[PDB]
């Protein structure tokens with residue numbers, strides 16, 4: 001379903017999820033899992049609201065969402081913390097830092113990775129419109145197959161457009177494109193270490209069963 | 220340290236290239252895979268050192284980088300080595316594997332499928348040799364003195380943007396193709412991770428030679 005890149009960015013602007021509005025050992029585990037669940041509900045809705053997503057296979061829709069909920073959640077946290085150095089804005093109410101993450105053993109390294117990546121995004125001077133395309137691509141590339149390639153190339157065109165609209169040379173444009181794209185490897189990296197810890201906490205019972213993200217964690 | 224033109228970098232990468240390696244069961248075939256990996260790794264360290272600016276990096280960094288991507292750089296090599304042979308994986312000339320012989324090892328066939336699917340995705344984009352070299356090098360430099368690395372990466376990025384330009388296409392089709400191969404690298408890393416997960420649940424006998432080679436990096440050579 002063909003449309004202009006400017007239009008795709010606007011529908012992605014609208015599709016955006018509402019802001020979820022919410023120290024000891026287990027208290028922060030259930031606060032984070034509470035937020036992750038509430039946010040996941042919004043993600044599925046957000047994902048469905050992406051043009052062409054619901055036209056995709058039932059298998060594909062699930063396999064995609066399954067393989068990136070963690071990353072899309074982290075990318076969201078990265079944008080929330082972009083203009084707050086040394087802080088991770090999980091929710092506008094519940095804000096945490098490096099010296100706050102020391103509560104649980106093993107959870108320190110992930111907060112460091114997230115902050116380091118947020119920093120790299122801050123240095124990059126990442127725009128809102130640039131970010132939206134990035135999040136959608138994170139979801140569509142975390143893998144009908146041809147319909148997906150089309151939907152991805154659409155958000156790729158939508159990102160190439162936002163990068164052109166900033167007003168810079170063909171070299172500085174392409175360089176900036178590749179910059180954020182290679183910075184996504186670092187988001188996925190942090191997402192994997194988070195999944196290895198999340199699945200380990202499920203197999204430790206420090207985090208509750210609760211809802212939805214329990215359904216996500218299994219498959 | 221360098222203000223070397225992108226064409227000259229693409230050339231250094233071409234000169235730096237390792238010699239291809241030439242070395243039916245389920246474990247001695249898996250032993251063949253680990254034997255091939257260990258010897259190709261020797262060439263990789265050499266190749267890595269031969270990249271401009273790499274040896275100027277922290278020796279700790281040099282090892283950390285090589286540690287986090289030997290598997291991926293090896294797999295990227297296999298996909299270039301398989302680009303023009305649909306349905307097969309040219310590991311070595313004397314070791315060609317395909318869909319018909321991965322079922323023998325526990326969850327190895329899954330990796331083969333991923334590897335073939337990605338190779339397919341690379342032939343559909345008609346990936347050039349010069350495009351591949353920049354990609355391989357970036358895989359290594361981005362798998363993470365830190366400032367020197369960002370410079371070296373931006374250099375290979377410029378070297379890739381240049382080969383993308385030299386093919387002669389519109390500014391939209393240029394940027395679209397850049398992002399295409401860059402997003403296809405996520406799929407290479409994905410397959411790499413699956414492979415590392417397998418290797419980690421295997422006996423230590425297998426990871427030891429990798430680590431011994433990586434710590435052999437204490438020069439001269």
Ligand SMILES: C[C@](O)(CN(C1CC1)S(=O)(=O)c1ccc(O)cc1)c1ccccc1
Pocket residue numbers: 032033035036039070073074076077090091110193194195197198
């Ligand atoms: C601290 C955290 O990064 C939290 N996350 C996991 C519980 C879902 S989370 O996915 O990073 C996350 C990110 C943003 C949010 O608004 C909500 C959650 C983490 C990672 C691994 C293991 C435990 C917690």
Ligand SMILES: C[C@](O)(CN(C1CC1)S(=O)(=O)c1ccc(O)cc1)c1ccccc1
Pocket residue numbers: 252253255256259290293294296297310311327330413414415417418
């Ligand atoms: C099937 C395979 O993908 C083989 N690999 C290494 C263990 C040998 S490998 O890393 O994928 C590989 C890649 C390129 C080569 O030229 C040779 C090997 C694998 C990966 C991890 C664990 C076990 C086997």
